Write a protein that binds this ligand. Structure first.
Ligand SMILES: NC(=O)c1ccc[n+]([C@@H]2O[C@H](COP(=O)([O-])OP(=O)(O)OC[C@H]3O[C@@H](n4cnc5c(N)ncnc54)[C@H](O)[C@@H]3O)[C@@H](O)[C@H]2O)c1
Ligand SMILES: NC(=O)c1ccc[n+]([C@@H]2O[C@H](COP(=O)([O-])OP(=O)(O)OC[C@H]3O[C@@H](n4cnc5c(N)ncnc54)[C@H](O)[C@@H]3O)[C@@H](O)[C@H]2O)c1
Ligand SMILES: NC(=O)c1ccc[n+]([C@@H]2O[C@H](COP(=O)([O-])OP(=O)(O)OC[C@H]3O[C@@H](n4cnc5c(N)ncnc54)[C@H](O)[C@@H]3O)[C@@H](O)[C@H]2O)c1
Ligand SMILES: O=c1ccn([C@@H]2O[C@H](COP(=O)(O)OP(=O)(O)O[C@H]3O[C@H](CO)[C@@H](O)[C@H](O)[C@H]3O)[C@@H](O)[C@H]2O)c(=O)[nH]1
Ligand SMILES: O=c1ccn([C@@H]2O[C@H](COP(=O)(O)OP(=O)(O)O[C@H]3O[C@H](CO)[C@@H](O)[C@H](O)[C@H]3O)[C@@H](O)[C@H]2O)c(=O)[nH]1
Ligand SMILES: O=c1ccn([C@@H]2O[C@H](COP(=O)(O)OP(=O)(O)O[C@H]3O[C@H](CO)[C@@H](O)[C@H](O)[C@H]3O)[C@@H](O)[C@H]2O)c(=O)[nH]1
Ligand SMILES: [Cl-]
Ligand SMILES: [Cl-]
Ligand SMILES: [Cl-]
Lengths: 426, 460, 460
């Protein structure tokens, strides 16, 4: 068999870029690749696209209701696709799961297809591993491509059909084929391992503040062991993004459902440590400002969950801001890329009384008691802090939640700042 | 401006011996004296049979023993003459009192500090090489300052060791990094830079990391904790794989191909062993509680709880598969060392799996190709060992008339055994419990032979 | 030898007013200016009717107001010319955020410190008189140092107040002790001695206690906690008495005759009230948690828990005695102030007893001979107050047709009521719940009348 026509249900943060990179019917450099394929081999006419490989790339948010609230994934969008696919299909076609789903979700899709059969739909798993802000580079040269299918003669042929698609630009040795369940579980486990590195280095940062060690020195020493590696060891106010907390909590929920309470509380610590890192950072700001920040002006420099993006989902800036808002602080928030309308939505259910969105950092720091850096934007390293200090109330504080001002502490102390950062004793 | 010409190392053990032997091999113009109180251990270093077995160690000592490397019992004289003093004594877990089973016993470290400052005059650099709790150098600096002399300048540095068992000479000659910690003071940097010059004889400068004293001490603890956390994490996944139909080896491969995660230390097992992983993680946990960091303490405690859970559930799997009773049943234990290609049994998972089965009254026949039988007898004691434990001479003796074969160590020979022969003389039904994934790919044959084979991270 | 000649006090409330009035009365050659942002309160000090009532206070102000005692709204000038600045502003319990219900809100203190260091030049002594958390003076010193000027020398002292309601003038003129805390430095000791000289005009030298700044702040909190602990301890005994047949009044007398224990503050009650006991104990508990002293925190938490338990069990006793339902029943609440001879109701046990009975749907008729009716409505509000709460203007109206009479405040008139008249118009059986032991000695006469009389610390 040879795949010649590909359909992708879901043109969002994932479905769009993946298919942009065979008649395929559905970030820096993304606008360039689409323009080279739109019209030759690259609509809302969903049924005909199905009726002529089908990628499922719809959202799977954490359930905010009912049983499993705040932990389980909501599969209602996935099932809607599966019903619509089997309605419009005859013959052979390959349905491929790309959304991040719980383990054994493909069994549900196969149940729907078999119960609505006609006088041959193969289900595969193909998770996504791109990271926001670097998606195009990750899609062009991925670390690995993961494809899962059943270990039957019918299933193994569907795997090879999808492998042939990726082999046009992915080396054969970078394409890993496993069973359906191992593929789904690997996506969840991969994100848990990444988040665990951040929570582990953040746990060390608390130890450093109490011992006089430095988390940047410790991370470097840890990272030079090639069995550990030097990636994802940057201590921070807490990891954000739309997938780390969601996938770990889903993993925890899956373990509780499968009667693995030891495994559930093992991975629960990744989330608990991240929450503790946020709460103690907020309490440090509040304590340094003499235990009261009512009507005090505080500058929030950085609102995105990481640099070089406008995404704010589960950003630590949201939680740090809400902690200070509960104390009645006057927040002046600047982010060079996050839309100002988004900041208002994130801090909403108080926003009118306490939250002001500044158009430049110097406006936000004018007359403020403290500067709180939550995002590692490169521009924060280059601000004129002697100018900022002149218009700040005294004493003036800088709370660096990202280690971006390292090496600048002596100058900032000479200017008159009390500078505090994560993983460094005050 | 200073140059270290004479080195003394207090402690001629697994660390002091090989580290100083390698330092002498790369530094011909520097005398290295390794001292110890143990008289028999010192003479064994000057014997043809070295007290510790390390591949390549015997040849390195013999090329320097006599030139610039020496072993001796004269601790006071070696300290008097040295420009650099290594503290490489043991720091065992306290088995008593406050912090029992978690905190480190610093009595040997303090004895060194007392003996050093007494037999010392002038300028000397004292370097912590043993695994010590964070801020232990502060205690050493207090002992030196409270027993000072005119024109006595003792500088304290931290220089932890990261060698592993079986590849120490390989690790010492080509380290991933050399870690040195000292003060920010002018005296501190000069002592740090003097020790850098020693390592620069064979370690590139980009691989020599200098930090403050506390970061150095904590990094040794944190490094071992991060490594053990990877094993417990992949072991937690192995439990998930067994309950979902996934395979932990396939999942580990998929995870490890992310270059931010890396593909090392993802081999699921019945549980990690060795003399330092559980010891350093628990010490980390104890330090956090003492510093009022309960969140950090219970975070790293999960690494130990997961390792313990992996062991217990494996023993429960054996008992449950054997019709919920193993009383008076013969069970073969293949592998007793905590890893392959060694005779070390410290904190080996085989000890705990055996004790679980011994508590049920099972008749264990234990075979290990490298571990001495007297060590196994000591490990399973506090009798019970006489009634239940038999140490076999080859795997076929241990499997003769047994209900199950339990593989706990990844010895390569276990993969190459005659299982048709073992199956014929085993009681039926015959079980294989693979706690190391060493029999992967052999499941079809073993099942065709008639075995019920069960392994970690694979649905039965 | 520095000499304090002009005193400014920021805060003309219950503390700042009387304390400065007494200082002016006893120190005729010292100018005393009490300032405040509330103009209606400042004018009330200058009017022939004071804002706060204390016996003998009206005579003190009228004897000084115009000579050396002044009440102005010009805060900046009073700070400018003062040698000593009292901070006597409110420090309420935080009702929001971290530490809600336990920590103190320091925003008013900080407002003073910033305004002082802006309107100050030269040498000035700044004195904490408000009840502040421990190390609050460290925060004031940071504001002063971070906003320093040339020739600006601000010294920070602690000087808490211990006056009680009803005896403020007596306590200020003849205090058990005057407590002054300052830094143990020559600059601090000089500032301490200058403030002692002011009090030395009428306080014996041995009654003026000088400590470090932190001991002074902590002593204010601990003193109130010790007093509240005596009440909770004797209240805990009252529960034991009810279950054993002992009498809490006999036990308290027997305990109190030990001169090491003393006979003060051993009067069992439905629970202590007032604006400072619960707030200072809870603040102490919060301080111990922030400093990682959980044993000390739960030790002092027991004072509050026992006070809450004494209240809840008294309410449950009323409900249980009334055949387990009080829905739509008329209940008379005699006494709403937190103690007799005052109209203050802050944290009054009557508030909590009333809310418990309101949650059951009882019809409360509340009488207090001094509390304004509008205050009672505010205290019992969040509706529920309109349906259930009636404010009577004499006790007999409140007891007319009621099932029970609940005495929560020890007003002397409640002992002198006509209980035969009350019994005739009460529903039967008629109950009296004495939460203050005010009807002691009347139990036989009340039982003969037909009442079921129940009181704290006496078996029924
Ligand atoms: N960095 C990342 O964002 C990323 C990377 C890897 C994996 N993932 C996973 O990939 C999935 C895609 O999420 P996303 O971030 O791209 O969100 P998204 O914005 O793409 O949301 C899915 C969108 O699909 C559209 N859609 C089209 N047809 C639909 C249908 N029939 N039913 C429902 N929706 C339909 C909807 O408009 C919806 O907003 C998630 O499960 C996510 O966890 C995300
Ligand atoms: N793989 C490893 O075992 C390894 C790896 C890195 C670091 N470390 C750490 O290095 C340290 C050294 O461990 P080891 O395995 O070499 O221990 P060891 O048991 O070999 O002890 C070292 C030697 O010190 C001697 N000694 C003790 N007190 C002495 C004193 N007062 N004077 C003279 N000699 C004295 C002992 O007799 C012993 O022979 C430990 O704290 C360990 O945690 C171990
Ligand atoms: N018996 C007692 O009530 C008593 C006994 C000892 C200690 N204390 C403590 O004394 C303190 C004051 O108690 P109080 O009952 O007198 O309070 P209060 O509310 O009666 O008086 C405080 C006064 O300060 C004024 N004020 C507040 N902030 C100001 C500012 N920035 N500038 C100028 N004026 C300002 C207010 O308007 C008010 O008139 C509290 O901390 C209390 O705990 C109380
Ligand atoms: O050393 C680090 C690395 C990251 N972070 C933070 O962790 C969060 C996640 O960062 P990153 O992983 O780059 O962002 P994502 O876009 O969420 O990418 C993750 O989530 C994707 C969706 O599941 C996966 O495909 C990717 O592999 C995985 O990296 C951000 O708030 C970062 O600031 C740290 O605090 N320290
Ligand atoms: O993927 C893996 C890797 C290791 N292990 C187990 O982990 C334990 C320890 O393995 P290893 O790291 O080789 O042991 P050691 O030889 O004691 O070395 C460790 O302990 C030393 C003592 O501190 C450190 O210096 C080294 O850096 C550190 O690797 C053994 O029981 C292994 O079976 C696994 O189960 N899975
Ligand atoms: O044996 C006793 C003594 C008192 N109380 C109760 O305790 C509370 C407090 O009474 P009291 O101490 O006289 O009232 P306050 O006017 O608040 O005075 C206290 O609170 C002040 C701070 O506000 C301190 O300065 C005083 O020293 C301290 O007595 C009231 O509800 C009393 O009914 C009892 O129940 N039993
Ligand atoms: Cl230090
Ligand atoms: Cl203990
Ligand atoms: Cl299956």
């Amino acid at each position: 068999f040879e795949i010649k026509k590909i359909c992708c249900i879901g043109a969002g943060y994932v479905g769009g870029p993946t298919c942009s990179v065979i008649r395929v019917t559905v970030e820096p450099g993304l606008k360039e690749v689409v323009e080279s394929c739109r019209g030759k081999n690259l609509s809302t006419n969903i049924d005909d696209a199905i009726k002529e490989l089908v990628f499922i790339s719809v959202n799977t948010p954490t359930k905010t209701y009912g049983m499993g609230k705040g932990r389980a994934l909501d599969l209602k969008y996935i099932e809607a696709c599966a019903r619509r696919i089997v309605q419009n299909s005859n013959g052979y076609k390959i349905v491929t799961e790309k959304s991040t789903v719980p383990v054994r979700a493909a069994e549900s899709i196969r149940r729907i297809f078999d119960a609505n059969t006609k006088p041959n739909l193969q289900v595969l798993s193909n998770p996504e591993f791109l990271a926001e802000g670097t998606a195009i580079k990750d899609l062009k040269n991925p670390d690995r491509v993961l494809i899962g299918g059943d270990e039957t003669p019918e299933g193994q042929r569907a795997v090879q059909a999808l492998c042939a698609v990726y082999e046009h630009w992915v080396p054969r040795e970078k394409i890993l084929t496993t069973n359906t369940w191992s593929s789904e579980l690997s996506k969840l486990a991969a994100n848990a391992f990444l988040a665990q590195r951040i929570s582990s280095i953040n746990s060390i940062s608390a130890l450093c503040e109490a011992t006089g060690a430095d988390v940047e020195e410790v991370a470097t020493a840890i990272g030079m062991d090639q069995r550990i590696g030097n990636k994802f060891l940057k201590a921070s106010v807490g990891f954000g993004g739309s997938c780390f907390q969601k996938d770990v909590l889903n993993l925890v929920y899956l373990c509780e459902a499968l009667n693995l309470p030891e495994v559930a509380r093992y991975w629960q610590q990744v989330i608990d440590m991240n929450d503790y890192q946020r709460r103690r950072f907020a309490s440090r700001i509040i304590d340094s400002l003499f235990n009261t920040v009512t009507d005090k002006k505080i500058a929030i420099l950085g609102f995105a969950f990481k640099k070089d993006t406008g995404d704010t989902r589960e950003s630590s800036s949201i939680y740090i801001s809400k902690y200070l808002m509960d104390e009645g602080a006057h927040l002046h928030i600047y982010d060079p890329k996050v839309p100002r309308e988004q900041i208002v939505v994130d801090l909403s259910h108080q926003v009118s009384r306490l939250v002001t969105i500044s158009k430049d950092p110097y406006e936000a720091c004018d007359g403020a008691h403290a500067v709180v850096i939550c995002t590692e934007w490169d521009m924060f390293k280059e601000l004129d802090y002697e100018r900022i200090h002149k218009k700040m109330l005294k004493p003036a504080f800088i709370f660096d939640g990202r280690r971006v001002l390292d090496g600048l502490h002596n100058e900032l102390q000479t200017i008159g700042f009390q500078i505090e950062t994560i993983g460094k004793k005050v």
